[PDB]
């Protein structure tokens, strides 16, 4: 389930 | 489901 | 469904 | 439906 | 319907 | 209807 | 109607 | 009507 | 009317 | 009227 | 009137 | 009047 | 008047 | 007047 | 006057 | 005057 | 004068 | 004078 | 003078 | 289970 | 089990 | 009437 | 009348 | 009537 | 009148 | 009058 | 009627 | 009727 | 009927 | 029927 | 039927 | 049937 | 059947 | 069957 | 089968 | 089988 | 098998 | 096997 | 084996 | 072996 | 061996 | 050996 | 009756 | 009956 | 019966 | 029967 | 039977 | 039988 | 048999 | 057999 | 056998 | 054998 | 053998 | 052997 | 050998 | 040898 | 040798 | 040698 | 030598 | 020499 | 020399 | 020289 | 010189 | 025996 | 034996 | 032997 | 021997 | 020997 | 010496 | 010597 | 030797 | 010397 | 030697 | 000298 | 000098 | 030597 | 001088 | 001077 | 001067 | 030498 | 001046 | 002036 | 002026 | 003025 | 004005 | 105005 | 206005 | 307006 | 409006 | 509005 | 609203 | 609301 | 609420 | 020398 | 020298 | 010198 | 000099 | 000088 | 000077 | 001057 | 001036 | 001026 | 001015 | 002004 | 003003 949050981090960093 | 967010990141980075 | 966003990225990058 | 956007990309790149 | 845009691309590239 | 544009391309390329 | 443009192309190429 | 242009092409090529 | 141009072509080729 | 040009061609070829 | 030119051709060929 | 030229052809061929 | 030339042809052929 | 030439032909053939 | 030549032909043939 | 030549022919044939 | 030649013919034929 | 030749013919025929 | 020849003919025929 | 919190930290730091 | 608290510390420090 | 011309020919030949 | 010309021929031949 | 012309020919040839 | 010419011929032949 | 010429012939033959 | 023209030809050739 | 034209040709050639 | 036109050609060529 | 047109061609060429 | 059109071509070319 | 169209082409080119 | 279309092309090009 | 489409192309290009 | 699609491409490009 | 897809690409690009 | 996917990419990019 | 995944990436990026 | 994971990363980033 | 873990990190960060 | 643990740290931090 | 423990500390702090 | 005409001839000659 | 005409000829010649 | 006509000829010539 | 016509010719020529 | 026609020709020419 | 037609020609020409 | 047709031609030309 | 057709041609041309 | 067809051509052209 | 087809062409063109 | 096909082409074009 | 195929092309194009 | 394939191309394009 | 493959390409494209 | 591979590419793309 | 690999890339991309 | 590795990268990325 | 390692990095990242 | 180590770091991180 | 050690740190941390 | 030791500390802590 | 007919002639003339 | 016919002629002429 | 026929002619003409 | 036929002609003409 | 046929012609024409 | 033959003629006539 | 034959003629006549 | 055939022609034409 | 042959002709005629 | 064939032609045409 | 042949003709005719 | 040949013609005809 | 063939043609055409 | 050849023609014809 | 060749033609024809 | 060549053509034809 | 083939053509066309 | 070449063409054809 | 070249073409063709 | 080059083309073609 | 170049193209092609 | 360059292209192509 | 450059492209290509 | 630059691109490419 | 820059990109690329 | 900057990026990249 | 800055980042990066 | 600052961070980083 | 300050921290760091 | 101060600490640190 | 082949063509076409 | 090949083409096309 | 190759092309295409 | 290669291309394409 | 290479490309592509 | 390299690229790509 | 390097890139990529 | 380095990058990446 | 260094970075990273 | 150092950092990190 | 030092730190850390 | 010293600390710690 941590995969979801990891992916979310990639979004949140590149914004 | 993380695939959706990963793809979203590619959009958000190249904008 | 991620296919739609992937395709969208190709548009958004080449603009 | 992604086909439409893919095609659109070919237009937008060659302009 | 993507056929229309594909064809359009051939016009737009050879101009 | 794409036939019209295809034909148009042949004109536009050979000009 | 594309016939007209096709024919036109034969003129325009051989000029 | 394309017949007219076709014929015209035969003239224009043999000139 | 294309007959006129066709005939004209025979003249123009044999000159 | 194309008859005139056809005949003319016979002259012009045999000269 | 094409008769005149036709006849003329017979002269011009046998010369 | 073409009769004159026709006759002339008979002369010109048998010479 | 073509009679004159016709007659002339008979002379010219039998010479 | 063609009579003269016709007669002349009879001479010229029998010589 | 053609009579003279006609007569002449009778001489020339029987010689 | 053709009488002279006609008569002459009678001589020339019976010789 | 043709009388002389006519008479001459009678001699020449009966010889 | 043709009388002489006529008479001569009577001699020449009866010989 | 033709009388002489005429007379001569009477001799020559009755011989 | 600590993986979840570790991932959460990456989100919370890059915000 | 201390791993959970260690991870928790990383969250709590970067907030 | 052809009799007249036939007779005439016998004259015109024996002259 | 052909009799007249026939007779005339007998004269014109025996002269 | 051809008889008349035939006869005429015999005259016109023997002249 | 042909009698006169016939008689005349008998003279003109026997001369 | 033919009698006169006939008689004349009898003289002209017997001379 | 061709007889008439045939006869006419015999005249028109022997002239 | 071709006979008439054939005959006519014999005239029209020998003129 | 082709006979008629064939014959016609013989006229129209020898004129 | 092609015979008719063939014949017609012989006329139309020799004119 | 191609015979008809072939024949037609011979006419239409020699005009 | 291609024969028909081939023949047709010979017409349509020589016009 | 390709023969039919090939033939058709020869027409459609020479028009 | 590719023959059919190839032939079709020759038509569709020369129009 | 790729032959079919290749051929199809030649059509679809020249339209 | 890659041949099929390669061919397909040539179609899908030239449309 | 990578050939198949590579080919697939050429399709999926040119659409 | 890395070839397979590399190829897969080219697809998954160009979609 | 690190090659496999490296390749995997290229997929997992471009999704 | 550190190569394996390094590679693993690139995956685990880009997810 | 410290390399192994250093690498391990990069994993354990980016999770 | 202190290197090993130093490295270990980096792990044990970032957990 | 021929006797009568024969006798008549003796008169008509000796006159 | 030919006797009658033969006799008649003797009269008609000696006149 | 030819005798009758032969005899008739002797009359018709000596007239 | 040709004898009759032959005889007839002698009459018809000497007229 | 050709004799009959040959004879007939002698009549038909001497008329 | 050609003799018959040959003879016929002599008639048909001399008419 | 060609003799028959050859002869026939002589008739058919001289008409 | 070509002789027959050759002969036939002479007829068919002179008609 | 080509002789037969060649001959046939002479017929088929002169018709 | 090409001679046969060549000859055939002369027929098939002149029709 | 190419001669055969070349000849065949002349037929197949002139049809 | 390329000659054979070249020749074949001339056939296959003119059809 | 490339000649063979080049020739083959001319066939395969004109079909 | 590249010539062979180049030629091969011309075939493989025009199919 | 790069020429070989370059050529190979032209094949592998146009398929 | 880099030329070889560069060329290789063109193949490996267009597959 | 870096050129070699750079080139190698182009291969290794496009696979 | 840093160029070599930089290049090496491009390989090692794109794998 | 720090350039060398900096470059080395780029390798050692992207592995 | 501190540059060297700073660079060294970047290596020693990213391992 | 404190710079050297400060830098050294960064190494000695991150190990 | 001819003596009888000779004598008979003397009677038949003097009647 | 011809003497008999000769004598017979003297009778048959003087009748 | 021809003497017999010669004599016969004198009879057959004077009848 | 031709003498016989020559003599025969004199009979056959004067009939 | 031709003398025989020449003489024969005189018979065969005057019949 | 011709006198002998002339005399001979009188005999051969009056027989 | 002709005197003998002349005398002989008188006998052979008066018989 | 051609004399024989020449003479033969005079027969074969006048028949 | 022609006198001898002329005289001979009278004999060969009156026979 | 051509004289023989020339003469032969005169026969073969007038038949 | 032609006189001799002319005289000879009279003999060779009246035979 | 042509007189000799003309005379010769009369002989070679009347034979 | 071409004279022989030329002459031969005159035969082979008039047959 | 052409007179000689003209005369020669009459001989070479009437032979 | 062409007169000489024209005359020559008559000879070379009538041979 | 073309007259000379025209005349020459008649010879070179009728040979 | 081409004269031979030229002449040969006249034969081979008129057959 | 083209007249000379036109005339020359007739020669070079009819040869 | 193009007339000269046109004429030249006829020569260079019919050769 | 293009007329000159057009004419030139006919020469340079028919050569 | 493009007419000149168009014409030039025909030359430079047909060469 | 583009017409000039279009025409120029045809030359520069067909060269 | 882009027409000029488009045309220019055709030249600069086909060179 | 982008049309101008698009066209320019084709030139700057095909150079 | 971005169209202008997009077009500009194609130029600045293909250069 | 970001479209303008996106486009600008493509230029500033491909330069 | 962050879209503008995101786009700006791409420029400021790729520079 | 933090989105604006996040975006700003990317700019202020990549500068 | 702490999100704003967290974001702010990233800016104030990467500056 | 301590979250706000914790976040504030990160700012006030990284400044 | 091209004359030989030119002539050869006239044969090979008219066969 | 190109003349030889040009001529050769006329042969090789008309076969 | 290009003329040679141009001509060669005309051969190599029409084969 | 490019003319040589241009021409060479026409050969190498039409093979 | 680029013209040489441009031309060279046309060869190297059509092979 | 870049023109040279641009052209060179067209070669190096189409090989 | 960057144009040179840009062009160079097109070469160095397509190799 | 940065343009030079930007362009240089395109080279140095595609090698 | 930072533009220069930014560009420089793109080089120094892609090496 | 901090922009310069920021940019400098991007260089100094990617080396 | 602290911005300068902040930026400086990014350099001094990444060295 | 403490901001300056805070920033200074970040430098002085990371050295």
Author numbering:
A (entry chain XA), B (entry chain PA), C (entry chain HA), D (entry chain 9), E (entry chain 1), F (entry chain t), ...: 101 to 115
V (entry chain N), W (entry chain P), X (entry chain L), Y (entry chain R), Z (entry chain T), AA (entry chain J), ...: 1 to 15
AQ (entry chain mA), AR (entry chain eA), AS (entry chain WA), AT (entry chain OA), AU (entry chain GA), AV (entry chain 8), ...: 401 to 415
BL (entry chain lA), BM (entry chain dA), BN (entry chain VA), BO (entry chain NA), BP (entry chain FA), BS (entry chain 7), ...: 301 to 315
BQ (entry chain cA), BR (entry chain kA), BT (entry chain UA), BV (entry chain MA), BW (entry chain EA), BY (entry chain 6), ...: 201 to 215
What does the paper say about this structure?
Here we report seven high-resolution cryo-EM structures of filamentous peptide nanotubes based on a cross-α supramolecular architecture that provide insight into the designability of helical peptide filaments. A structural interaction is identified based on an appropriately placed pair of arginine residues (RxxxR) within the corresponding peptide sequences. This local interaction motif, designated as an arginine clasp, is robust within the context of these cross-α assemblies and can guide the coalescence of helical protofilaments into structurally defined cross-α nanotubes. In contrast to most structurally characterized filaments based on synthetic α-helical coiled-coils, the chain axes of the helical protomers are oriented in a plane nearly perpendicular to the long axis of the assembly.
For example, each 5-start helix of 15-10-3 passed through every fifth protomer and therefore corresponded to the axial stacking direction in a protofilament. For the 29-24-3 peptide, the interaction occurred between the C-terminus of peptide (ia) and the RxxxR motif of peptide (ib + 1), in contrast to the C5-symmetric structure of 15-10-3 that involved helices ia and ib. Despite the differences in cross-sectional geometry for the respective filaments, the helix crossing angles were remarkably similar and lay within the range from 95° to 105°.
